[PDB]
Design a protein around this ligand. Sequence first.
Ligand SMILES: NC(=O)c1ccc[n+]([C@@H]2O[C@H](COP(=O)([O-])OP(=O)(O)OC[C@H]3O[C@@H](n4cnc5c(N)ncnc54)[C@H](O)[C@@H]3O)[C@@H](O)[C@H]2O)c1
Ligand SMILES: NC(=O)c1ccc[n+]([C@@H]2O[C@H](COP(=O)([O-])OP(=O)(O)OC[C@H]3O[C@@H](n4cnc5c(N)ncnc54)[C@H](O)[C@@H]3O)[C@@H](O)[C@H]2O)c1
Ligand SMILES: [Cl-]
Ligand SMILES: [Cl-]
Lengths: 328, 321
Amino acid sequence: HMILVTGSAGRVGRAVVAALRTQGRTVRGFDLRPSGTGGEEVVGSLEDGQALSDAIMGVSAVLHLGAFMSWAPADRDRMFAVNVEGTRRLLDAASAAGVRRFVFASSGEVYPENRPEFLPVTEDHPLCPNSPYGLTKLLGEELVRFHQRSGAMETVILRFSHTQDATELLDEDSFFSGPRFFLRPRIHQQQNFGNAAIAELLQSRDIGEPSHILARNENGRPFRMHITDTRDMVAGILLALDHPEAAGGTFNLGADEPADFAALLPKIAALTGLPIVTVDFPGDGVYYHTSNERIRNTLGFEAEWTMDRMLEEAATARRQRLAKEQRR
Amino acid sequence: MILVTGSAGRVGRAVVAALRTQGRTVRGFDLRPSGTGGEEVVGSLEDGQALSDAIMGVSAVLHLGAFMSWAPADRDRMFAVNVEGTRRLLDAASAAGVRRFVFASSGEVYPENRPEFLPVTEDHPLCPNSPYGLTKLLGEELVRFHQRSGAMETVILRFSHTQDATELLDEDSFFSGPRFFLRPRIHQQQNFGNAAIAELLQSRDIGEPSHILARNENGRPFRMHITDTRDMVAGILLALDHPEAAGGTFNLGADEPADFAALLPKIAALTGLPIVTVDFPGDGVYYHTSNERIRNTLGFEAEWTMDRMLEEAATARRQRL
Ligand SMILES: NC(=O)c1ccc[n+]([C@@H]2O[C@H](COP(=O)([O-])OP(=O)(O)OC[C@H]3O[C@@H](n4cnc5c(N)ncnc54)[C@H](O)[C@@H]3O)[C@@H](O)[C@H]2O)c1
Ligand SMILES: NC(=O)c1ccc[n+]([C@@H]2O[C@H](COP(=O)([O-])OP(=O)(O)OC[C@H]3O[C@@H](n4cnc5c(N)ncnc54)[C@H](O)[C@@H]3O)[C@@H](O)[C@H]2O)c1
Ligand SMILES: [Cl-]
Ligand SMILES: [Cl-]
């Protein structure tokens, strides 16, 4: 046996590789960057046929987590090249090599979660993406479904929750959680995205010291979304790899309940000591519940990392960081 | 200015001809010249430069250009032309302020060759089983993304298999030759590398040229829609012009499929050739596709019955002979 994990230098991919190696399993990574773990890995691109053939040699299962995201139109061609064409060729190569199971990392942006037709969002919700990234994942799902119906290779489609390492949650410098929960990092993120109207609104709400942000929509409805610990995503991915009943399946993978920002921000602020600034953003905002009932019932998935557990760990990490910075 | 991609192909050249006869302003776009001398870009959907030149000053796009191949060596190109080319053309059209974009899709998106229910309606699941069918499904999703997101109107037309009337009784035509004549079908299957099917067909040869009546392994005659190019052109004009086509998805083709057990004797009555009946391994082809939506929404009326098509095909055959 040999398991190929693409995107093995990324958040989830590295954790999946690590888990498999603690099991003593033979794993090969495949990522544009080295992982820095010094494990067996191809350092190369999903765009390159040579890298694909090298990566697939002798492989019995593929966990396809490698993908590219960008908001810049300059990068859109690359996003389709990596996410659509790369997935297409990797699927064909895996099938030709007699791979037994191919697990595809999809996203709730295929629905999209940011514009649900009903709640909770189940796997049979329409697939009507409104972002180019969501569109690439939908096209990827269709490539996977084509193989599911036509070859001996088993497939699993997993629609990922937004995923964080617990320690990222209370780190101003984290890529997602910094702007998600801290006002000044969000000002900076929005400026760098070039969203001037939002950036200026955020700056206008600054209270003269660092603060948390509690994001709500134009009607003052607090944001709500699934934030899932990397460790639970890993557990579900391992189930997708090994469980008999995963074959041919499509599953939302994420924690049971969304974080309600109205409840969550006070809990966060109780841990950091920072004041909270509430901002009403234009539009519907982010407000979704995504059902993980199918994966719970079909594969026996159970998430263990509740937001309360994640926050406790995030806080410990933050305090260690601040102790070091302040020489305490 | 109407841009028609695939303008040197079967349906595209006819659409361009129809629009030009009406006195409309049309620009072609195809890998090949049309041979008509009309305004056209000779170039590729894979070429960003060619896309830029083709889209300039354009107000509507009829996107009929695409590549089909059964060979694995050709699969990368099929995806590059049908998926990536469509993606970039859509983006170019949208940015240029194109008012309506009509996309030529296929019954292969369903697929018609393995229906879940009959007749096949637009809400039939989309589960293609050929790489070509897959490229058209992905193209449809690209169009749907634009339909939902931009001001550019879209129309998706799922095409019936389409023939010029004259092709039907021509042994040398690409589709109808093998479809209805035994020896051309042997040659086709040989050139595809389907050596064992070619051998079955060869074993049925009666020592002179013959028609083939294709059935499945249980002797169920094949049944499929074969629509005249002229009816497809009529439907495409409606997709271009009709206010109610906007945001629509329509099966485009004639009302009824041809059942080959009925069709082949009609064909043989016109050519004089004997008929050889072949029972192919597997489920064969058997489908009815509903055009009710386009009939009732756009006022589409198919006019070229198979009998009319065959009369024209026979006349053309007789002139050739
Ligand atoms: N983390 C999330 O919140 C989240 C949510 C929904 C979906 N997803 C999807 O789940 C998967 C993994 O999530 P993640 O957080 O670990 O993503 P990540 O961005 O942290 O990791 C992605 C990895 O893919 C690699 N990659 C990019 N282009 C490549 C190429 N051409 N060839 C080889 N590798 C390439 C990157 O180098 C990167 O290491 C991705 O497909 C992602 O799109 C993630
Ligand atoms: N004829 C049918 O039975 C049928 C059935 C279902 C769907 N379709 C689809 O309807 C459309 C019209 O079909 P047709 O019968 O006219 O086919 P066709 O093969 O006669 O015409 C296709 C044209 O597309 C052009 N083309 C190919 N690659 C190109 C590229 N990279 N750039 C620019 N042009 C390119 C070709 O040169 C050709 O002229 C096609 O999209 C086809 O896939 C046709
Ligand atoms: Cl947010
Ligand atoms: Cl046939």
